């Protein structure tokens, strides 16, 4: 029937003054544009079909046109920029905005696929679905008192929509349609299927991106406690974006940050820290390092939490990246922590694993081992332990290493280098 048309024979169809025609040919180029092997959206496109398919969108007499006119639009518009943009010029923003309304489930739910696409494309796209009016129709198809009773796939299909409409920067979303969506998003991250969760957790990561006014909206309305739930669960796509959103907020403000400890997030970042997923290990390390950059009380949480072994261990053996994570988590702790607290980091074994990474082609992670050190010994120097401290670090071959960078590429090194041999060494 509509297998393998070519597109000449698209056009003749669809340019046919017969509406039944027309929906064959329609249909014909939606099965065209949904084959794996190199989709010829270009020549579809080139074809000049993208406007007669938007007008089709229009046809409430004829919903197999419309439904069929909307997938075909959709699998342009899930393409690459320029092609999403090519559906945006031809009208379609609007009419599937007008679609979401439709009697017919397919036919709304092929809309909010093609308006999260077409808004996931980048901010401007987003910012003009929203000026188009597409956000109080969207969540008016979720307004029901049990999420249970929507279909599987339409629910998944609208929390992935929302969470375009969520998603990039530069700018962030409008406050105000973020005010609008969220406490849909939080009904969402309660909802109990996986795919929807994901989705949930993305969006809340989203918009916990950016400033403490953008992480205070968010953590306002109460979601961390559910968050940090989520956080344990056994699903990777679960867990990757609850600590994303996590490591967010802990970027914020010490009562932010607190929020997340009181919700009892600590608990899980023994199993965090030694997750063998690299990037679960090196996010989780990330947001140590901003949890150990607060206040003394919440490094002492994190004490008190048994963490601090577990950070000495991510620096002694993990991917680089982690490592460099891990270092900055100390730095930060040493730099706020108290004299006792830098004591009792040297009793779990920080030393030799920091020494041991000045080994490291990199500058960065370099200053901040120094950065560290010298914290080490500040601490050291108001209890009179320079000495035994220099011993432990001429010991396990820490010494060599630092001498080593005086003779070193960029000059900060040098010069924090040089000032602690001169200072604490002989
Ligand atoms: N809730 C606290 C927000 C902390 C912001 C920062 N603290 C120093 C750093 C935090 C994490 C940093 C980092 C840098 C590079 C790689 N990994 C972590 S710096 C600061 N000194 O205002
Ligand atoms: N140099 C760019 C501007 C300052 C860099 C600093 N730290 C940047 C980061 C590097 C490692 C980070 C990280 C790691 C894993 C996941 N997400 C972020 S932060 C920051 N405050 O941003």
């Given amino acids: 029937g509509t297998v393998n048309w070519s597109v000449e024979d698209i056009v003749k169809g669809i340019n046919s003054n017969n509406l039944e025609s027309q929906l064959q040919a329609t249909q014909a180029a939606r099965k065209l544009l949904s084959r794996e092997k190199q989709p010829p959206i270009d020549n579809i496109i080139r074809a000049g079909l993208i406007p007669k398919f938007v007008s089709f969108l229009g046809k409430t007499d004829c919903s197999p046109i419309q439904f069929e006119s909307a997938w075909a639009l959709t699998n342009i518009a899930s393409g ?46 987003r910012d003009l ?21 929507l ?73 961390v406690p559910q968050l940090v739930k989520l956080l344990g669960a056994t699903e990777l796509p679960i867990v990757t974006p609850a600590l994303r959103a996590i490591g967010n907020i802990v970027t914020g403000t010490d009562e932010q940050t607190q929020k997340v400890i ?19 290990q090196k996010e989780a390390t990330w947001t140590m390092s901003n949890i150990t950059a607060g206040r003394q009380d919440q490094i ?10 577990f950070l000495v261990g991510v620096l002694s053996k993990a991917d680089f990246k982690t490592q460099k994570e891990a270092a900055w988590a100390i730095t930060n702790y040493t730099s706020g922590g108290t004299v006792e607290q830098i004591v009792y980091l040297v009793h779990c074994g920080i030393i030799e694993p920091l020494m041991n990474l000045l080994s490291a082609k990199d500058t960065k992670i370099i200053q901040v081992i120094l950065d560290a050190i010298s914290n080490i010994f500040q601490a050291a120097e108001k209890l009179g332990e320079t000495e035994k401290l220099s011993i432990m670090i001429e010991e396990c071959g820490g010494l060599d290493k630092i001498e080593a960078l005086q003779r070193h590429e960029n000059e900060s090194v040098y010069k924090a280098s040089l000032n602690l041999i001169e200072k604490y060494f002989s």
């Fill in 80 to 125: 690459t920029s320029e092609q999403t943009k090519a559906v945006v010029d031809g009208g379609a923003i609007p009419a599937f905005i007008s679609l979401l309304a439709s009697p017919h489930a397919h036919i709304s739910e092929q809309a909010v696929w093609a308006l999260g696409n077409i808004a996931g494309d980048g901010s401007a796209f």
């Fill in 129 to 149: 679905v929203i000026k188009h009016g597409a956000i109080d129709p969207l969540l008016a198809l979720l307004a029901v008192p049990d999420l249970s009773t």
């Fill in 151 to 223: 279909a599987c796939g339409y629910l998944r299909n609208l929390t992935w929509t929302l969470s375009n409409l969520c998603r990039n920067k530069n700018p962030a979303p409008p406050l105000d349609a973020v005010e609008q969506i969220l406490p849909t998003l939080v009904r969402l991250l309660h909802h109990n299927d996986p795919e929807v969760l994901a989705d949930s957790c993305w969006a809340i990561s989203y918009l916990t991106d950016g400033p403490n006014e953008r992480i205070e909206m968010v953590v306002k309305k109460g979601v």
């Fill in 262 to 280: 009181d919700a009892g997030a600590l608990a899980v970042f023994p199993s965090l820290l030694t997750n063998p997923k690299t990037n679960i």
């Fill in 300 to 309: 002492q949480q994190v004490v008190n939490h048994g963490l601090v072994p």
